[PDB]
Design a protein around this ligand. Sequence first.
Ligand SMILES: O=C1CC[C@H](N2C(=O)c3ccccc3C2=O)C(=O)N1
Ligand SMILES: [Zn+2]
Length: 109
Amino acid sequence: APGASIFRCRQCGQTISRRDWLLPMGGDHEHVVFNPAGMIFRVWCFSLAQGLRLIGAPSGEFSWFKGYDWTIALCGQCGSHLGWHYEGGSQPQTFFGLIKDRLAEGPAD
Ligand SMILES: O=C1CC[C@H](N2C(=O)c3ccccc3C2=O)C(=O)N1
Ligand SMILES: [Zn+2]
């Protein structure tokens, strides 16, 4: 009965990812970053995620991960901004960077 298994959207409970899918990018699954608006994010990298809606076309502007282009990832259920999907890079080609404090962690479904 693990209690730290699944990540859900904090606002609505949509299933988003899993602890098993944490991805250590450059040696750490956690990356502390800031955007041009000065917002600090504690980003957890995941190999896979679900329940999101990726919005727009990819952009390389201000990417926190060298070689990757990003798209905003919203909760597909409630529209909460949960992070970004990264693509266009290498090893892996793609991954998700999700904002840790916008997820709730809990037992499996
Ligand atoms: O890797 C990334 C993801 C996108 C993120 N980003 C933002 O969070 C943001 C907010 C407002 C204007 C422009 C941006 C932007 O590039 C960012 O700065 N780097
Ligand atoms: Zn949600």
